[PDB]
Design a protein around this ligand. Sequence first.
Ligand code: 542
Ligand code: CL
Ligand code: CL
Ligand code: CL
Ligand code: MG
Length: 213
Amino acid sequence: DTKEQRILRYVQQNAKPGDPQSVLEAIDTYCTQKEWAMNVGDAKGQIMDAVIREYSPSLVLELGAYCGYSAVRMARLLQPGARLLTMEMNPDYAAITQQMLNFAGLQDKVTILNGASQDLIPQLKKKYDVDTLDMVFLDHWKDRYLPDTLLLEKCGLLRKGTVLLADNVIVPGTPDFLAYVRGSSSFECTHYSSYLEYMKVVDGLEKAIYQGP
Ligand SMILES: CNc1ncnc2c1ncn2[C@@H]1O[C@H](/C=C/CNC(=O)c2cc(-c3ccc(F)cc3)cc(O)c2O)[C@@H](O)[C@H]1O
Ligand SMILES: [Cl-]
Ligand SMILES: [Cl-]
Ligand SMILES: [Cl-]
Ligand SMILES: [Mg+2]
């Protein structure tokens, strides 16, 4: 019995089916009062919400679902017909994420793919009929942010204007990615200072808007 399964059970015992805000609240409660977990959390989540509402993306890719917190967060703000694709390599976590989304009533807006981003990204055009992505949320292994950004470009999945939004650019940090996007003429970057989930420790999100090749 794992921490992730305990979070899911707590949501099943304390939230309301079909109510995404009650799911977010239950997770945040559990992780504040019982056991910390690496969800984006409410402080950074509010910044994500503001960014999503600003750009109104039709197709979002999430790298690293974990328990599904950010997938609930983002999916609840998508317009009718807009979609989220989320990649999660750990089969147990993929199942928790799907169950979380089902409980929240958001399943029609999301596709949870159980595999590693480096294997799945090259399949998005052929298998999933994706043209380009409007937004990418990076929240998987930190040493994979830069490799996967470069892969997304190689596969033709970024357009002029695609919004990348990266968690944890301060803690744990993603130093190669952050240096790269800030130094590159192909990205216009904005830093949003915030706090590590459930902690009084500075963290931040980076927005990096692709400018084309
Ligand atoms: C590499 N390709 C991949 N493709 C698909 N899924 C992938 C994946 N890599 C990892 N994953 C999945 O993403 C998730 C991993 C995320 C890694 N996150 C962190 O390490 C992390 C770590 C902290 C953290 C902060 C402070 C601290 F003291 C300790 C930890 C905070 C966060 O917000 C984090 O996001 C898991 O669900 C994992 O199975
Ligand atoms: Cl749109
Ligand atoms: Cl730049
Ligand atoms: Cl928080
Ligand atoms: Mg994170």
